[PDB]
Write a protein that binds this ligand. Structure first.
Ligand SMILES: CCCCCCCC/C=C\CCCCCCCC(=O)O[C@@H](COC(=O)CCCCCCCCCCCCCCC)COP(=O)([O-])OCC[N+](C)(C)C
Ligand SMILES: CCCCCCCC/C=C\CCCCCCCC(=O)O[C@@H](COC(=O)CCCCCCCCCCCCCCC)COP(=O)([O-])OCC[N+](C)(C)C
Ligand SMILES: CCCCCCCC/C=C\CCCCCCCC(=O)O[C@@H](COC(=O)CCCCCCCCCCCCCCC)COP(=O)([O-])OCC[N+](C)(C)C
Ligand SMILES: CCCCCCCC/C=C\CCCCCCCC(=O)O[C@@H](COC(=O)CCCCCCCCCCCCCCC)COP(=O)([O-])OCC[N+](C)(C)C
Ligand SMILES: CCCCCCCC/C=C\CCCCCCCC(=O)O[C@@H](COC(=O)CCCCCCCCCCCCCCC)COP(=O)([O-])OCC[N+](C)(C)C
Ligand SMILES: CCCCCCCC/C=C\CCCCCCCC(=O)O[C@@H](COC(=O)CCCCCCCCCCCCCCC)COP(=O)([O-])OCC[N+](C)(C)C
Ligand SMILES: CCCCCCCC/C=C\CCCCCCCC(=O)O[C@@H](COC(=O)CCCCCCCCCCCCCCC)COP(=O)([O-])OCC[N+](C)(C)C
Ligand SMILES: CCCCCCCC/C=C\CCCCCCCC(=O)O[C@@H](COC(=O)CCCCCCCCCCCCCCC)COP(=O)([O-])OCC[N+](C)(C)C
Ligand SMILES: CCCCCCCC/C=C\CCCCCCCC(=O)O
Lengths: 204, 37, 150, 27, 39, 348, 151, 150, 151, 150, 151, 51
């Protein structure tokens, strides 16, 4: 591994020096200088929100595109000898196309709740308004990464169902049950995404 | 007063320049010659 | 009440309860469902009996969903910092242990349905290991409920 | 006329920038 | 004095996030190696 | 983790090699070939399977030898199609499979070189899978194998010839020993390379290479009883590759008897219950008719693993079992000797 | 009415990420499937103009990011609000990372597809349909970028 | 009383006691679970006797579950900083030692049940090494308990 | 009106990154395809001046970065506003990294194309059509770098 | 008395004395435990004679256990920062030396058990080398003692 | 008028990186192509004075870095403006890393060019032509380094 | 950088010098261009140190 040795070197050297920087803030007196309050409060509630709106659609279609080429290479690979696959097994493509639909539906839902304000002070920007920033961030992560992971899930089982169908045509209906359980993880993300932002209201 | 600026102008350049320096120096440190002849 | 930045960690507790348990449920269904389509060519008889390792990983997702609904409904504006750390430590306890239960179901469930296709005596032993692999996620559930409800 | 332009241009510039590197290599 | 005052600390958290995207897109491109022979 | 990649470069070639698996003749296909009475009728029965119309242009008298090479020329152009499309996790892997045929072509090439004959031996009498149609210096070498060994290092078998002194192959070592020492160093180099590749292609392939080394361990120490090769010779003919390495290879070097290789095979419960071939019984499957069925059993379990390179090496070793079976069917039919026609290996 | 002095940073970074990450995916779609053209062109030289449809659909991925990069660059102004510029950063990631992923999926399926079409032409009416599904993912990131930038 | 962020380390103790024991017990169940399927194709008699690596790895998870519950019931708003580091240090203690015991059980459990298929005399020795790998989690338990009562 | 003292950093980083990343793209287009020219030449040496089209199409990627780097360096003044330098930083990254991507796609298609062209001359009409599509990725990055440098 | 953050480093001394020694004892058990199964196929008589290297790695675990309890009994609310640093260095000195000693035991325990399966004369020499691998943790123990007494 | 006390750090890093990275590019251009000289010359000793053109084209890349390292080292003064020092830093990266790219490109196509020239000398008139287009990448970085150090 | 160039060319150059003595005129000619990289680094280190 050559390129992995860079990321394994950056991740070690970054933390390693966090540790020495972590035992030198406490050891003098300088823990007052750390201020996770000043990090979460001073910066913006637009940065957390608009990243989560961006991460909702983009990370979902990352796993949606990921799920296609795992089984789409399996469609054309097994389809050379057995061309009867191509029409029956496109439902595995749609099962990793629904996870992009769950992304873009939640993306236009989360984008509608963002509204500009005028305040610039952490006390003037109230805790109703900073919670509006963090909830759009966490909703974007729980619909972005969840549709990513279930995008790989229905793609991997979709690739295996594409290859058993080349051997025996009577098998694909039974293996299609597994992709239903794999696609249920995508709907589980959209449930939490609309529950984290049900009570929220951004604006002033 | 410009301490946030000057600290990162040195830091992200220097570890951005040293990361280029180790990646290059690696690639040339081993380069797979045709050494039999 | 609580400070403005307090609501951040409870949202991360609601997210990481669902994100990491999604990664467990994804690996538990993909790695095991790879083995289902593989064994089905030589023995299509267990093609409906061996769908139970992919549903043991499905309960790992619903372990993460229950604590997600618990935290996202108990979340409110101006919660204390003590309550938000409890919900942050709740979601890390269930999602990252469901990640462990997701990996343990997938590795065993893939290997179990290969040995069951080679010898059907393993099926009474395979479901016993999948019990032990799933209760890793169940222990993460009951520690999340004892942390968030304080 | 064609080849004596391009080939003798190598002889000029390798003397021309070469003389600076020749001078510097006496250090 | 402020090692990170908020604005550089927003621009760094934006850039070092999408540098994880760029080095991911580059790592996929750096491995699309060609074939050896033809027929 | 090693499974959500490997469809980037090798996704098309996995479904292609598994589509070729469905054309391997099943038990029902082998029953139709047994009931034939003439090789002309065997040609029409093979038209129902994937092979169809491959013997259309040959002749009116259909000899069994033209059935043999036409069967082996079909699996070559199936394999040569796959090696042209593997980029480089798999092209070097597919090159490792052809080294087993490059060894058998090299030792075939050094024998006529010692007896002063050249290229006319090479083209008709070499295996097309490990072939010499490139590196043209090896074809123009008519020198007596000392100025040709310096050419032979220009060939991807050069990494295996580091235990091969050039003078030692010049009639000082026996010609069969120079095969099994080459196949020894080929096996550890192929075992180490499949260990560098991680994940699914490390536990779907090294179980096959463990038994292949122990086929090489057992058959050497049984067929080296009457002949004047020392025990230190067959100890260095053993591949340090498999289950018998630290313990069993020492006991096979001391055997001197068929009964002593049997009791050291009873220490391993997988390698015992294979030594019941029992040729003292007049008609039965012999020891190597039981080693073949355990070989194709491990290749059949390679297809149960999904995201791995071992599907390719198993496919060649099962398509080679087809060309062994159909020839054995056709040689029992042409000789009209179908009392042992059931002694084939039913893979699928 | 006036914002901070660093407010315009996130919008132009969304103008850059909309074009860079789309062109990174379109380069993977052109190079990986373009490698598959040379492998099929030796044996089957009839399908050469037929098989440009993977690299053409990868070219649509680049103009997906080009549209949003122009739309963000025309909405730029000195002293813009912090709300408006962060909208175009989220618009840049929405069309950038979408085109990077959809540019990958067109590349792998297009590389495997033109090698499968050259051995059986029945796959050519199915390979184009899989590429059709992979292309809408770029359009999925497109229309959410149109919502965010014009907001 | 103490500062408000003191409870962050305590819930990090209750979290890391669970997941690191669970990540260890997942490795004990998965790595030994592949060993069950590889041996049972040849020896179908030793499937119910051979499940003891996945059960002894399950005791690692209940080692973490005890300390995770004991810390979570000892939680209060406004705990002192000294009390919070005790539960944080107890959480990493039972967790990472249970994580290490989770690796050791999975390795010797995998190689052990491959050996018992080849010789039944190893079955008395396999439980002896598996006990010695299991007490490492027990050593972490008694020091996590001595930190939580304080 | 007068910008801060550090405002000139981002604009000159836009000038350098527009030239560096476009040269790194044009280097990969020359190096990867130039190895394909030498492997082509030993069997089919008639098509050598015919086959230097992938090495000059990578050359247009280099002059794409050179043009905007002068367009950025002509707009440099001391005391420029922080908004104006952020435009030229986003202008330089959007042409260099897009030129980096377009330099990669020319390097792979140019390598695989000229090797297959020596075994099939029909590929060259198909090869140069893919190379057109791979080269406009730099041109897409060019027109967004210009539209960020006018304002 | 000392500062409030002082007791964090002392309980980090209690944790790192345990989890690093347990990681060492897990490596000595696992790496040598595969050697027992590889020996047992041919020489089942030296099974109980070969439990010694996983016993010698077990003493490494209780080496970190006695100093972890020694630190945890010396804990108090508001200890001095000088005293808390002494227990932190006492914890890292026994764990990381125990991790190295457990690494040294497992390597020679693997090759020595495999080596003595072919020749019984190595067994007197193998247990001599394991003595030198154990005292590395014993040297780290006695400096952890004199750092904890002050 | 008088700049800050830390101002000369960035312009010094432009003087060093213009020489460090350009010599690193000229290192790869000499070493990778010098391997191809000794591999070719065992069978064709006549072409050893004609084949040293890829190692002198890499030598020009070092003089491309040497010139601007002098240009930056003569604009240096105690208390230069922070605008001027960022110019010399952005000048140095745009010639060093571009010369690193041009030096890496010369080394690859110079090595592969002299391997195929040993088998056919008709490649030699084409090898120099690709070596020209690899060498202008350093010249493109040079002429933008001069326009940044002019101001 | 200069030590990398003399390291590689000095490695492969003396491999071909034994098999053919004609390379010795060409091998030391490449080592001229390999060494001046350190020499060019000298005169910029000099011109930075006079100020
Ligand atoms: C300080 C910390 C020090 C400690 C850190 C690390 C210590 C150890 C580091 C050594 C590892 C280096 C990586 C390496 O070896 O190169 C690799 C690739 O390299 C590339 O392909 C180039 C990648 C460019 C990265 C440029 C970073 C600049 C960031 C600037 C940011 C500015 C942003 C502005 C935009 C090797 O090449 P390969 O051929 O792929 O080998 C693979 C072989 N294999 C295929 C068999 C697996
Ligand atoms: C080892 C690690 C030791 C460092 C962590 C110390 C944190 C707890 C210390 C503490 O007491 O809190 C202090 C802050 O302490 C900090 O805020 C430090 C945070 C810096 C970064 C920590 C990263 C650790 C990475 C780990 C790398 C592992 C990665 C491996 C994979 C609080 O101090 P205080 O209470 O405000 O001061 C007394 C004030 N009073 C009197 C009002 C009470
Ligand atoms: C990796 C090695 C390279 C690392 C290099 C970093 C060295 C940078 C030197 C900067 C020190 C400046 C300084 O503040 O002095 C400090 C000395 O603190 C030290 O000097 C401790 C040195 C820290 C190195 C840690 C490695 C030791 C590992 C084992 C004194 O700080 P102060 O004056 O006490 O201010 C606090 C006053 N207050 C407590 C009242 C708030
Ligand atoms: C995990 C998943 C994510 C969770 C991550 C969580 C990261 C950390 C969560 C900490 C919770 C917030 C505490 C805080 O900042 O509030 C207060 C304490 O601020 C201080 O100054 C005290 C010391 C700094 C923070 C110490 C935290 C140590 C945790 C580090 C360990 C890291 C180890 C990780 C490995 C702010 O001070 P204040 O009194 O409110 O000032 C207001 C008064 N004023 C208005 C007048 C200015
Ligand atoms: C990994 C890379 C690590 C990079 C880490 C980088 C950390 C960066 C720390 C910067 C700290 C603040 C900057 C600053 O303003 O301080 C000073 C700027 O002085 C400088 O700019 C120094 C920068 C030189 C660093 C280069 C070292 C690399 C050499 C490596 C080669 C070794 C090879 C050996 C083998 C100015 O001081 P002041 O306080 O602002 O002035 C006010 C005071 N007064 C009013 C009294 C005048
Ligand atoms: C390998 C091993 C390497 C490990 C090396 C480790 C070297 C670090 C040791 C330095 C600590 C000693 C300094 C000191 O005296 O205390 C200081 C602690 O302040 C700091 O810790 C300085 C660094 C903080 C921010 C740097 C982030 C690093 C991220 C980089 C990630 C890159 C990852 C890329 C890969 C106190 O300073 P101060 O009192 O706050 O005064 C500041 C001025 N002010 C008042 C204006 C704010
Ligand atoms: C990893 C981050 C490493 C940087 C650590 C650090 O220096 O903390 C820095 C902030 O940084 C934070 O507030 C901590 C936020 C961590 C989030 C990381 C994502 C604290 O360093 P500082 O410059 O002293 O903070 C500004 C001072 N002030 C808060 C009084 C205004
Ligand atoms: C290598 C790159 C080197 C990069 C080095 C980082 C250099 C940052 C320091 C320069 C300006 C800092 C600054 O003033 O912050 C300003 C914003 O500035 C930003 O927004 C910084 C954003 C950094 C992005 C760099 C582009 C990389 C893109 C890569 C993408 C790849 C795909 C805001 O100023 P302020 O702090 O809010 O004002 C407080 C006043 N005070 C400062 C007097 C206190
Ligand atoms: C101030 C910015 C400093 C950081 C600049 C970042 C630009 C670095 C660019 C990449 C240089 C990498 C060179 C590695 C050559 C790869 C070898 C090869 O491809 O064969």
């Amino acid at each position: 591994t050559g390129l992995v040795l860079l990321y394994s070197g950056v991740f070690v050297a970054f933390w390693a020096c966090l540790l020495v920087v972590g035992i030198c803030y406490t050891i003098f007196d300088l823990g007052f200088r750390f201020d996770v309050a000043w990090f979460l409060t001073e910066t913006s509630p637009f940065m957390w929100s608009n990243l989560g709106i961006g991460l909702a659609i983009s990370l979902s279609v990352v796993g949606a595109a990921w799920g296609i080429y795992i089984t789409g290479s399996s469609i054309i690979g097994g389809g050379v000898k057995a061309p009867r696959i191509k029409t029956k097994n496109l439902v595995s493509i749609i099962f990793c196309e629904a996870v992009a639909i769950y992304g873009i539906i939640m993306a236009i839902v989360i984008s509608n709740m963002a509204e500009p304000f005028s305040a610039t002070d952490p006390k003037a920007i109230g805790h109703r308004n900073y919670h509006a920033g963090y909830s759009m961030f966490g909703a974007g992560l729980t619909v972005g990464l969840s549709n990513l992971f279930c995008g790989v899930c229905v793609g991997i089982v979709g690739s295996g169902a594409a290859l058993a169908d080349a051997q025996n045509p009577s098998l694909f209906v039974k293996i299609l049950i597994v992709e239903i359980f794999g696609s249920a993880i995508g709907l589980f993300g959209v449930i939490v995404a609309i529950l984290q932002t049900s009570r929220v209201k951004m604006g002033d | 007063f410009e301490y946030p600026v000057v600290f990162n102008l040195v830091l992200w350049i220097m570890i951005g320049l040293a990361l280029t320096l180790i990646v290059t120096c690696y690639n040339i440190w081993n380069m797979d010659p045709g050494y039999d002849s | 009440n609580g400070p403005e930045y307090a609501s951040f960690f409870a949202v991360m507790g609601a997210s990481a309860a669902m994100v990491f348990s999604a990664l467990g449920a994804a690996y538990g269904t993909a790695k095991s469902g790879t083995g289902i389509a593989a064994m089905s060519v030589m023995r299509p008889e267990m093609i409906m009996k061996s769908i139970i390792p992919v549903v043991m990983a499905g309960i790992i997702a619903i372990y993460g969903l229950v604590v997600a609904v618990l935290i996202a409904n108990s979340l409110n504006d101006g919660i204390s910092l003590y309550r938000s750390f409890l919900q942050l430590g709740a979601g890390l306890s269930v999602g990252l242990s469901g990640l462990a239960a997701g990996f343990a179901i997938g590795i065993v469930g893939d290997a179990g349905v290969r040995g069951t296709a080679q010898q059907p005596r393993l099926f009474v032993g395979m479901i016993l290991i999948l019990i032990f692999a799933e209760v890793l996620g169940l222990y993460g559930l009951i520690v999340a409920l004892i942390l968030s409800t304080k | 006329f064609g080849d004596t332009m391009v080939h003798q241009a190598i002889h000029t510039i390798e003397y021309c920038l070469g003389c600076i590197s020749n001078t510097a290599s006496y250090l | 004095a402020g090692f990170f005052s908020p604005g550089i600390w927003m621009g760094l958290l934006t850039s070092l996030f999408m540098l994880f995207i760029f080095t991911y897109g580059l790592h996929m491109i750096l491995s699309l190696k060609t074939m050896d022979r033809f027929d | 983790f090693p499974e959500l990649y490997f469809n980037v470069d090798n996704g098309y070639l996995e479904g292609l090699v598994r589509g070729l698996k469905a054309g391997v003749l099943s038990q029902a296909d082998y029953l139709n070939l047994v009931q034939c009475e003439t090789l002309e009728d065997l040609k029409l029965h093979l038209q129902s399977t994937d092979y169809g119309n491959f013997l259309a242009n040959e002749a009116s008298p259909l000899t069994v030898s033209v059935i043999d090479d036409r069967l082996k020329e079909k699996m070559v152009v199936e394999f040569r199609h796959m090696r042209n499309h593997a980029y480089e996790p798999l092209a070097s892997f597919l090159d490792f499979i052809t080294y087993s045929y490059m060894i058998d072509n090299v030792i075939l090439l050094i024998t006529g070189t010692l007896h002063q004959r050249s290229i006319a031996e090479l083209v008709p009498k070499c295996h097309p899978l490990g072939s010499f149609e490139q590196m043209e210096a090896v074809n123009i070498a008519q020198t007596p194998a000392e100025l040709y060994n310096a050419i032979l290092v220009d060939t991807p078998l050069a990494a295996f010839f580091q235990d091969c002194i050039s003078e030692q192959d010049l009639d000082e070592m026996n010609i069969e020993i120079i095969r099994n020492t080459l196949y020894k160093a080929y096996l550890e180099s192929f075992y180490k390379f499949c260990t560098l590749l991680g994940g699914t292609t490390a536990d779907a392939m090294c179980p096959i290479l463990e038994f292949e080394a122990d086929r090489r361990a057992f058959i050497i120490t049984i067929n080296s009883f009457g002949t004047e090769l020392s025990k230190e010779d067959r100890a260095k003919l053993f591949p340090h590759c498999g289950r018998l390495y630290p313990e069993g290879l020492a006991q096979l070097a001391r055997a001197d008897d068929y009964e002593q290789v049997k009791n050291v095979a009873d220490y391993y419960p997988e390698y015992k219950l294979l030594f019941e071939g029992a040729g003292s019984n007049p008609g039965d499957k012999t020891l190597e008719d039981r080693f073949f069925e355990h070989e194709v059993k491990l290749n059949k379990l390679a297809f149960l693993n999904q995201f791995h390179f071992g599907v390719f090496y198993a496919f060649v070793k099962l398509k080679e079992q087809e060309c062994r079976n159909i020839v054995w069917i056709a040689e029992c039919i042409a000789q009209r000797h179908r009392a042992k026609i059931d002694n084939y290996i039913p893979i699928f």
